[PDB]
Design a protein around this ligand. Structure first.
Ligand code: HEM
Ligand code: HEM
Ligand code: 9P7
Ligand code: 9P7
Ligand code: H4B
Ligand code: H4B
Ligand code: ZN
Lengths: 413, 408
């Protein structure tokens, strides 16, 4: 590979030079003859697989703290090496855990919020043994991160994978999400994205209120055991009713959303160690709710209803009634969060901050991997600066990864 | 291997085999994706390329290994041997041109690919000739508002010193002027080209929407200036169906998007001059041309007139203004009976096209970064459509601006 790759911004003419891509560790899925950049997704580590992965990470940590080649560095290498030899795995120090979590975020190509990467509260839950204990750790996380509306980015990290039959898993895709219910007539109540998970919860014993915005229970698996249900205390679940600054009728739509986006189904990989339960949270970009959650056809799908209340001509697509309604909905989401003082960022601010982050990263780190397809917001793409910015995408480690759904793999006891 | 693409909204899963055919590089590697980067002969090289193309042409007309097929390969071989090149048949030319369009991974309008009027201009020898061919193209394609896709193909490259080139980036574009106070009048995208026209003798009206002259290079000679006859230039005054004040902005655009700086490659042959044209998707003008910061940049002016609060970005004043502008553009073109497609309609057609191509051809190369419209992305079906990008030939390629290579 070429040592220097250039990216250009076609709006500002600014040219950046990437050297960091040489540290790329895994495959993107693309080849020389085909690009898979719009594909959504294109038994444990053996001792010999584990050695060089650990060393790579340890070197990286010690390089970051300006102690590369030091006695403490060489000693840590030796201690790790001996641990893998005698136990087939190793345990990270707290400092290394914190560094690795922050870097998984820093390395997340698809995240437009990474300017904040170094400000991440890390909770070490590696001493947790039961699903009840996971619940306790999770409640504390939610309360800390919510902070009465002044959100704080955080991650809680449960014990790493051992033999793969003792995995810790949060079965929820996010800590807070709304139930979806399929009706006998084929219609869907609540959030259609969550129907499958909802059915599992009901089967596991959950009594469903069967409403439109029912906060799902936690379904928590510890040490490879069967998962257990827990209700999050409602006072810990911060929600915002959606209203519009001009349209008095908007509140009559009865919409609301939760303040804390807290993804709980990813896998954190550090130094070849695998943390299958590592729920993390930041705060929302408005479009996540206003465009995707509300206006996707396979989600809440509210465009028609809003357009009708806006008295728009909905007969021809060329009237842009959809686009017109889309903007008002996103105005409403941002207005409601700001009014209740719950942290949220609009897509203009977020993308402008990302450009500055990207430029800084190129300066100090020699690059910043970015997935344009994900970075560009789902509305008004070209009026944000990221649209015009060439990006290079590649995978650095530590990283957040997708993993299979736990109900697909779990061995029921 | 067979590759699958999934639509995440419909859950439809298509299977791509067509990608196995590509031999050209994309720029990405196993470790680095360049999907958002805008830009990632000899007898010996020439014959296999010719052979590949003849083969797929005769394969496409259901006569692979026919008597005609064998003879053509032999004929082409002799011609490359004895002349260092070869000439396409008319049929091959037309097939080649339609397929370059079909294979254009960045084009959302490809449902139309087989409907393309091909104007053969390979007998052209002078800039005056080029002008004549171009006028006929514009007149035919414009068709009084009922636009018709067309391509005019000028003689292929020989030694590189005698290229035919249309120096304009589009046949019809507006001039851009650098003002004493450092601002720009008209279209900033064309400031450089405009300056070259001025220096070559063009007397500029110095307005906001001055139709540029044609600057035409034939056979490697110095380019020459021509004024397109105004009656051939269809333009649309932009008004809004609800905001009576919108027409007071004095905005307009031309009806015919006619890209003129690309290179058409067929069977190893290079057509450095091949202006082609279709019709507009509204966002091209309403989002990019009008609202890009580096273009006409009208958002602030429009938002003023809408009396929006422009203090905080979270008011989404830009997004509001953007929608209204695009409403105006569509309404204006439609009211004037000038062909235009909205991004909802176009992306919808593109999905149907993809379905067609997977069914009959085994896939469809597509560049999601370009296919998804620059506004309202995820409320169009292409946002939710996984796409595989790969390079098939015949193709349209970029080439350098002629003023960076030409000696006078
Ligand atoms: C602090 C404010 C943050 C903002 C505004 C933000 C913004 C975003 C947005 C808008 C996306 C696209 C999500 C989607 O469309 O589904 C995203 C993706 C992502 N974010 Fe961030 N984020 C923040 C914090 C975090 C944190 C704290 C982490 C981890 C420590 C993180 C890691 C990721 C990852 C791994 C993805 C890719 C998600 C996927 O592939 O499904 N982000 N972020
Ligand atoms: C008939 C109606 C057509 C529509 C609605 C349409 C639509 C579009 C749009 C919106 C783009 C993106 C352009 C940009 O953002 O700059 C594009 C790209 C492209 N189109 Fe089409 N198009 C049409 C006809 C054609 C024709 C007739 C040809 C050639 C024979 C063609 C070949 C291409 C190529 C090569 C690109 C890529 C341009 C580049 O790489 O800069 N299209 N099309
Ligand atoms: C349909 C689908 C969607 C997704 C995106 C989920 N990722 C959301 C996410 C992740 C991290 C975030 C961090 C901050 C924030 N505001 N939003 C964040 C949102 C993944 C997989 C599939 C599948 N299959
Ligand atoms: C600034 C820049 C822009 C571009 C995109 C031009 N693509 C226009 C185009 C091409 C073909 C079209 C076909 C139909 C249509 N409606 N519009 C069509 C518009 C490429 C290179 C550079 C550079 N440097
Ligand atoms: C098909 C396409 O890859 C898919 O719809 C992607 C596009 N870009 C995205 N970008 C973000 N931020 N989030 C998404 O879910 C998606 N979906
Ligand atoms: C940097 C990025 O590749 C560039 O801005 C692209 C993005 N997608 C695009 N898509 C279309 N249709 N037209 C464009 O000019 C661009 N520009
Ligand atoms: Zn790629």
């Amino acid at each position: 590979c070429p040592r220097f790759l250039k990216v250009k911004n076609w709006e500002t003419e600014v040219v950046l030079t990437d050297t960091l891509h040489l540290k790329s560790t895994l495959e993107t899925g693309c080849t020389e003859y085909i690009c898979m950049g719009s594909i959504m997704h294109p038994d444990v580590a053996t001792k010999d697989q584990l050695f060089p992965l650990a060393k790579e990470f340890i070197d990286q940590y010690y390089s970051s703290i300006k102690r590369f080649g030091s006695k403490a560095h060489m000693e840590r290498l030796e201690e790790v090496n001996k641990e893998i030899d005698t136990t087939s795995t190793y345990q990270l120090k707290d400092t290394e855990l914190i560094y690795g979590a922050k870097h998984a975020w820093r390395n997340a190509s698809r995240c437009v919020g990474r300017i904040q990467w170094s400000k991440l509260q890390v909770f070490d839950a590696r001493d947790c043994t039961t699903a009840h204990g996971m619940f306790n750790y999770i409640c504390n996380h939610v309360k800390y991160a919510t902070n009465k509306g002044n959100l704080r980015s955080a991650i809680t990290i449960f014990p790493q994978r051992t033999d793969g039959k003792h995995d810790f898993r949060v079965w929820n895709s996010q800590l807070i999400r709304y139930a979806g219910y399929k009706q006998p007539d084929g219609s869907t109540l609540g959030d259609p994205a969550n129907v499958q998970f909802t059915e599992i919860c009901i089967q596991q014993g959950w009594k469903p209120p069967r409403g439109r915005f029912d906060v799902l229970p936690l379904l928590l698996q510890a040490n490879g055991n069967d998962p257990e249900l827990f209700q999050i205390p409602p006072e810990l679940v911060l929600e915002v009713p959606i209203r519009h600054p001009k349209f008095e009728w908007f509140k009559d739509l009865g919409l609301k959303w939760y303040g804390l986006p807290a993804v709980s189904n990813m896998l954190l990989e550090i130094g070849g160690l695998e943390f299958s339960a590592c729920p993390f949270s930041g705060w929302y970009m408005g479009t996540e709710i206003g465009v995707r959650d509300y206006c996707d056809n396979s989600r809440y799908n509210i465009l028609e209803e809003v357009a009708k209340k806006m008295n728009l001509d909905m007969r021809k697509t060329s009237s842009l009634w959809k686009d017109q309604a889309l903007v008002e909905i996103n105005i409403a989401v941002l207005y409601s969060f700001q009014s209740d003082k719950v942290t949220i960022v609009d897509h203009h601010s977020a993308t402008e901050s990302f450009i500055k982050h990207m430029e800084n990263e190129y300066r100090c780190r020699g690059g910043c991997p970015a997935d344009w397809v994900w970075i560009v917001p789902p509305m008004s793409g070209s009026i944000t600066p990221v649209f015009h910015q060439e990006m290079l995408n590649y995978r650095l480690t530590p990283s957040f990864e997708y993993q299979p759904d736990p109900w697909n793999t779990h061995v029921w006891k």
